[PDB]
Structure formats: C-alpha cells, structure tokens
Amino acid sequence: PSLNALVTGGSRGIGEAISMQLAAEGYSVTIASRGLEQLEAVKAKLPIVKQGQTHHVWQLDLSDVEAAGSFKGAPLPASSYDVFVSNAGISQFSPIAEHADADWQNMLTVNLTAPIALTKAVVKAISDKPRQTPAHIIFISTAFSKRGAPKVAVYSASKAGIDGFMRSLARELGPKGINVNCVSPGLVRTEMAEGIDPSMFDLPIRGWIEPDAIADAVTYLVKSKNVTGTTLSVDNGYCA
Amino acid sequence: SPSLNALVTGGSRGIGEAISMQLAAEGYSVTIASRGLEQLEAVKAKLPIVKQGQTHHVWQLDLSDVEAAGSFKGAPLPASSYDVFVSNAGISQFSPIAEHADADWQNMLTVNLTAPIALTKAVVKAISDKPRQTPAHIIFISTAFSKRGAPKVAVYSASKAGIDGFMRSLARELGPKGINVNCVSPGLVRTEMAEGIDPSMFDLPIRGWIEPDAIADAVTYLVKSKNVTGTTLSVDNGYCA
Amino acid sequence: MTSSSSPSLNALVTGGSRGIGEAISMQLAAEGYSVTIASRGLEQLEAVKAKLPIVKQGQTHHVWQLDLSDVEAAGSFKGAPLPASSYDVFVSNAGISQFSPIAEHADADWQNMLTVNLTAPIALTKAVVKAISDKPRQTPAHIIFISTAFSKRGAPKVAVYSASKAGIDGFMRSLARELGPKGINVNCVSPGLVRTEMAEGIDPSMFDLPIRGWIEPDAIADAVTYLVKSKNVTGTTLSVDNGYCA
Amino acid sequence: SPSLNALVTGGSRGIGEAISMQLAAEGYSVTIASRGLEQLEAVKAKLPIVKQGQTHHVWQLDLSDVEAAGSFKGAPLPASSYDVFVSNAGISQFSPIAEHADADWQNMLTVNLTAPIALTKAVVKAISDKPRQTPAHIIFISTAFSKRGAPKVAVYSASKAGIDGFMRSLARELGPKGINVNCVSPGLVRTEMAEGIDPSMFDLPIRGWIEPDAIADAVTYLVKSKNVTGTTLSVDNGYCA
C-alpha cells in the first residue's frame, strides 16, 4: 500500500529532488507551495511506480501560520501522511544592523513558525494510529545552524530553532512510532544563493552540492526505523 | 575608571534578578527591563551601589511587542550607552505539542526569540562602531532543553535553540566589531518557570534545583572575559552530559 | 548504457567477521564491492566470506587474519591479502566494549580496549591514507569509522569505552578536513545499543530511549551503505541510536 | 577557612602555571606535577600564599609513564588529599598523518589520554567514597581542535577528543558521589601549540593568540562552581563558533 508523504517547498530545487525520490520509492507525494503553475509542472514529472500511488498539489502560502496549522487547502487530511518533509525555506543574507524587519520576521515565520504549526497539525492527526513502520518527520535545516557564519544571524536562528524542535519532538513522539530528524544541507546549487557561494568558504570538499544528494539523505531516513533526534549534515565538510 | 552600563531583560525576578545584583556588585550601571513596574522598582531598590558614578535604572518593556523592543520605546538610556546586554527574558510552557494552544506558544516564541532579535539589533546598530579598550558583551540565557531534547517542551526548546543559533552567527559577525556573544544555558532553577517539574523527573548527575545565583556566576565570568565568544556555558547539573 | 570493463571496488572492513562488521561486509558485497574482512578469528571470517554475495564480474572477497590488538601489524599491513593501495573504501569497525566503574576497571583490560579501539585504527588509517592519498579519482574514497553514541552522551561505567570512540570522532573530523581535497571523504556512523556489540551489563532498558529495544546490526550497515554511495558527506557522525543522543 | 589540596599536571609551564597561580591566589594548596624539576621549584616559589596553613608541593613526574601516574609514584601526597585535580598534561604535534612518525603520535597518545586516565582512575579510587560539603572537581584541559576538524592535527585532535568522551562519561558516573567533571577547551594559546599552526590560519571571530591567564580563569570559575559537570568551557576566540 502506497504511503502518503507531505513535502513542503516541493516546487523547486531540494524539495523537487526530494519529492521525485519519494515518488520513485512508491510514495504518494503532496507538494505544497505558493507557485501553482510550478507545482503542476513538477506533479507530472513525479514517477508513478506503484499501483494506487497518486500525487497531489497543495497551493499553500508558507507564511500563513493559521492556514498551515488548519491544513487550509490540503487535498488530503493530516491523518493521511506517513511522512512529512518540512523543506519550507527562505534565506536572507544581511548584517544584523542592516537587516530589514519585514524580511527577517517573514523569514522567521516561513522557516519556523509555519513549520511548527504544520507539524502540530500532522502530529495531532497521526499520533494514535497503528503502524509497523515508524512514520517520519524530517526537517530540512542548514549547515549554518550549527557553525556560525557572519551575516546569516536570523537565518541560522530560524533553523537552529528547527533543530531544537526536532530534538524535543523526537523524544516526545518516539514512543508513538514517529521518528523525527533534520537533514542539514550546506551550500546547494539552487535559488538560495544570490551573493553567497562555496568559494567564500574553505570547504574540505570544493564546489556546490547538488539537490539530489540532499534527497538521498531524506530517502535513507524515510527508509530507516532506528534514527531519531539526529541531523544528517550534507555540507561538503562545512561543519567538520 | 568608569561605571559601564548593562542592560538585562527579565531583571525583575529569578535568574535576571540574580544576574542584575551580581552585575551591580561588580559596579555595572544596570538597567532592568520587564513588564511589571512595581516588581522593577523593588529590584532597583535592592541593586547594590559600590562605586561613585554607578546608577541603576528601570525600563518598563512588554517583552511581546517587537516594534517596542526594536525601537527602544521607554528606554532610560540610549542604546549606545550599553557595554553589556544580557537577554534573559523567557517564557516556559510544558505541553504535548498536540494540545499546545496556538496563542501560548506563538507568544512564547515572540518573547523568547523574535523580540530579543529586534532588541539585539537595536543594541548592535548602536554599539558596533564604538571604540572600547575591552570587548562588549551580548549574553543570552538559553536553556538545557535547547541542546538535549525533552518531551512536551518542543516549541520552548525551539525558541531557545533558535537563540543559540542567532548567537553563533552574531559571535562570528561581531567578533571584529569588538563584541563577544555567548549563551548561558541554565537547567532547572528555583523560580516560577513552568511548574510541576521537579529535578526528580530527570536522572541528574547532581540532584536538586539550581540556585539562580549560580547562573549569574556564569554571566559575571563571561562579562569579565575577552577571548570567549560563540560558546554556551552549561550550568545544568549535568543534564546535557 | 553498457561497458566492456566496469570495475569492482575494494572495501576493507576491520571487525567484519560478526555483528555490525558482518552486516556491513554483506551489504557492501551485495552493492558490488570486493570485500576484505579482517579480524582475529579465521573460522568466523571464512564463515562470513562464503555468505558474501557475488553479483558482479571481477568481484572476489578476501580474508585477513589480523590481531587488532597489534599496532605494528595494523600499521604494516602484515598478512594482508592485498596492499593498502587497493582499497577505495575503508571501514574501521574494530572495537571492544567494557563496563566497570572507572575505579574497579582492570588496567590491562581498559588499556587493551584503547589500543583496539583507537591506537591500532590510527595506525591502520595512516597506512591507507599514505597508500591512496595521491592516487587519482573522480569519485571520492571513503574512510568510515564505526563509533558509538556513548562518545557524544556520557553514561556511567563506560568511561574508557567512550574516550576511545570519542578519540575516533576527533580523529575523523581532523582527517575529513585534512584529506577532503585529496578526494577522501571521512565519517563516523555512531551505533546506539545493538545486539552482541555491548554484552556484560549494559542494555537499552537502562535508558529512556525514544525507541525502546536493541538495534539490528543491519541498521548500522544501512548508514554505511548510504555514506559509501555519497559524495558530499564528510566530517560527520551518522547516529543510529534509537534516539539516545537526542 | 581550610586550604583544600589541588593536583595540576603540566603545572610548570604556560597554561599549567597560570592555572596553578590562580588556584593558589584563591587559597588552594597546590601540587604541580611535571618532569622538569627546576621549573617546579621556580613556580612553587612564585605560588601566592593567602590562607592560614596553605602549603604548595611538587611532584616530579614523567607524564608518559602510565604505571607511575597510576600508582602516584614519587608524589608528595596520597591521592586521598586532593579535592581538585586539573589534568593539563599535554603535548601537541603538527604533521600530515601520512608523515606522522609512529613513535611520536603514540607518545602523544600516552601523555594526552592514557596517562591522565590512569591518573584520573587513581584520584577517583581514593576520593570516591569520602565524605564532602562542596563537590570535588576533576577538570581536564582539552583543545578546540577536539570538536572542530583542522588538517595536520589528526592524533592531537583525537587524543583530546578522548579526554572529552572520558569526562562526559565520568560526569554521569561520579556526579552522585559529589565529583564534578568538566573540560576547559583552549583555542590557540601562547606557547602551548606546536610551531607550524597559528591563529592567522582561521577566521577567528577574535584575532590573535590567547593568554594562558584566560584559560586559568575558566578553571578558577569551574573550581568555585557547584552545579556544572559534563561540560566543555571554550576559551577559543570563537574557533568553534
């Protein structure tokens, strides 16, 4: 039977790479994002490999914390999902002093407040249901949230808060058959790079990290049942 | 031979009280900030004066107004006056995240992380380019639960781990600008934090409550230091061990 | 699509004759690696060798009787079926556990555990790193240490055990940095409590694990397979510990 | 006002000296242990006396000799005496692992890890069951390289990460017996680091070398604390930030 996976920020880059690999592993993938034009493009490319495997669009504004919390516009209930990948992701590069309040508070809503809400809703729905395999809550964090860089203060903070969430949730929901983990990318070839670039950091492993490599980690986790409370750093040796 | 100014959010009781006292005992001109003006004046009255030039202040500030925190609405002093800012204001809520009231945790998020970001920005916008013999100190009070997860305290841990994150980046951004940035991470301390939860309920290497004074010892040590930045001091009875 | 020569890569697994070792070898073998399994006990070695899949042309497995308490032997690749320069993957799983209040902990015991867990794998790694440092490659080599969750969250009565694997962690981070520009990715998989890798008076029930019970050795191998296929992961620990370090 | 006994290995030079000095400045009876005998007398001569019946002492010792450390061979006091032990026994070696001579990195391993384990085991043996008002302190000196990877320091890093694992475990083990166990993690410090590696090679939030005194600060703070165990105290100019 085709398990249901929710992947926020599934429109592009890492979320796409994730949604694809999950579809490829027989999962029914709901992607959630602002861009509908974009969702549909991506919906058609998701492999259908297992019979009964349907995919879904969710148009969702990632800064709407009541909508996320109330599953406003979701094609399926929160009770459905056996997997939730929190990849909702905006990054902003400014010195704290220059960093506009509209920006960093929006970032901090999108990267953390909405995820919490969305997570709450899911965990409410799926805690008491039976299952032989654990269900999976997996947050896409960032390398930056463990080792500090200049000019990514509020960004780092939003995703260190995520790391803190997962750690506690992992201990809270482990007896409920819910595994909770982060995957922590380093610098990836995407739309999370304006000024900032690999070269500006002396990496043990030079160059960009591709999305599909971030996905591999998600795929590994989803398939696991002994991994909770952990971060899987795919960061070319950034935090080493 | 001057008296430097210290700002200390949540200075009206508990950890922030113990810190403010010790700071004032070391000759800082402590401003305390919090919601309840009556409780403020009582601690201001309590703060020691051991130095001509030393002069303590109160700041009525609601911790959940970010415009207010951000702008310095109500401040005794200028932002640039501060050589030491201790972000100690926090809210703690024990709940299975399934029945965690939206308004409670969103509010706790604001108090714990959002507002301190805005306030921390004001202070940094002000004190960045200032000259100074020795370095300026931003010190957040996080919590042990930010580092080792615990059940039924997700959003709490999130907010304070969020702080840990902020401070790591800031330590890196503001090192050259002469500001050191660190966290002190208290465990269970004898205050009005959450409640119901006893030191019995975890397997602590050191049994018992932590006394708020002990936390202040960490802040005092940090503020007296030069080469410490990006670090958490854990005073947690070995909880994170 | 096709090729007239696709090569089998050489993997070395120390402590590969039972438990986690056994599991990893199995999994690397089924992925197409020519597996050299190494440890003291030759019967068990051969026993597993015969079980290792062969799924590929030009894939052969090997056995190395190696006394892991022997630093010199580890360092000089003494008795090794192949030279150090053969290996694209090296998995240091050689390890011992011991339980004791520090005060009751016999000197000959803990000292031997240190050699086995830290000293000798340093020696072994040096030999590999020297022999493969400057060999050209498009895909990275993998050095993987199997560590333990006790290296990162303290527990009573595993003092020298934790030190030893913690030393392996501090080793791994330094090398990841060192050898990353030489196309060598260096990592730790960190097992929590798994069946027959601890023994003698420590078990999951003594700890409030988010996930109760022992860990099957296959779970550890899943991590090691994942790493070995990875290209952008170095200087990290992958915890498989039923939530112990959380 | 009784003078408590403190053992400090590698107490003669650099960070050792600073630690020893500040301990004695606070009233502790110090035993500095090292191989160089003129250095011991030198430093012993300079240790402050501030407390009635405060006495200092030396113990000439090869910190590469694990049997001698383990048996307290030659020590001027029994293990039972000491309420404080600071394991600053240390050696750094910069080299490519491929080029790192067997004899060397194993001798480093012995001094950094093996010997302080034997030394720690001896202390814990002889003060585990003893009855105290304040907890005793076992404090290891580590390095920042033990938590952040840097090239050409693989075994140095490793050896001190061993010390990190050791103290975390021991904290959990001995907390209930009123032993607190932590590490102070120094970054790059004047005179302690093997020539070939220096602060300019890292984008430290704070530029430069660190004075040993700043290490001895973190120690002095731990020694006087009561609710801190299983922790690392980084004085590392933010290397690990």
Author numbering:
A (entry chain D): 7 to 246
B (entry chain C), D (entry chain B): 6 to 246
C (entry chain A): 1 to 246
Question: Please, what does the article write about this entry?
Answer:
A large subset of alcohol dehydrogenases belongs to the family of short-chain reductases/dehydrogenases (SDRs). One such enzyme is ADHA, an alcohol dehydrogenase from Candida magnoliae DSMZ 70638. This enzyme was isolated for its ability to reduce several ketones with excellent enantioselectivities. ADHA is a homotetramer as typically observed in most SDRs.
Here, we present the results of the application of FRESCO on ADHA. This has led to a variant which has been mutated at 10 positions and displays a drastically increased thermostability (Tm = 94.5 °C, Δ Tm = +51 °C). We found that the M9 enzyme retained catalytic activities, though with a 100-fold higher KM for NADP+ (1.0 mM, compared to 9.5 µM) and a 4-fold decreased kcat (0.25 s−1, compared to 1.1 s−1). Superposition of the wild-type ADHA and M9 tetramers revealed a very close structural similarity with a root-mean-square deviation of 0.58 Å for 956 Cα atoms. The only considerable backbone shift (up to 3.1 Å) concerns loop 196–214. The observed structural alteration in this particular loop immediately provides an explanation for the increase of KM for this cofactor in M9: the introduced E197 seems to occupy the NADP+ pyrophosphate binding site. Along with the shift of the loop, the carboxylate moiety of the S197E mutation induces an interaction with the guanidinium of R18 – a residue that crucially binds the 2’ phosphate of NADP+ in the wild-type structure. While the favourable electrostatics of this new interaction is a likely explanation for the mutation’s stability effect, it also explains the lower affinity for NADP+ (and the absence of the cofactor in the mutant’s crystals), as the salt bridge neutralizes R18 and occupies the NADP+ binding pocket. In summary, the detailed structural analysis of the mutation sites reveals a consistent pattern concerning the stabilizing effects: all stabilizing mutations of M9 promote hydrophobic packing of side chains or install highly polar and charged groups on fully solvent-exposed positions on the protein surface.
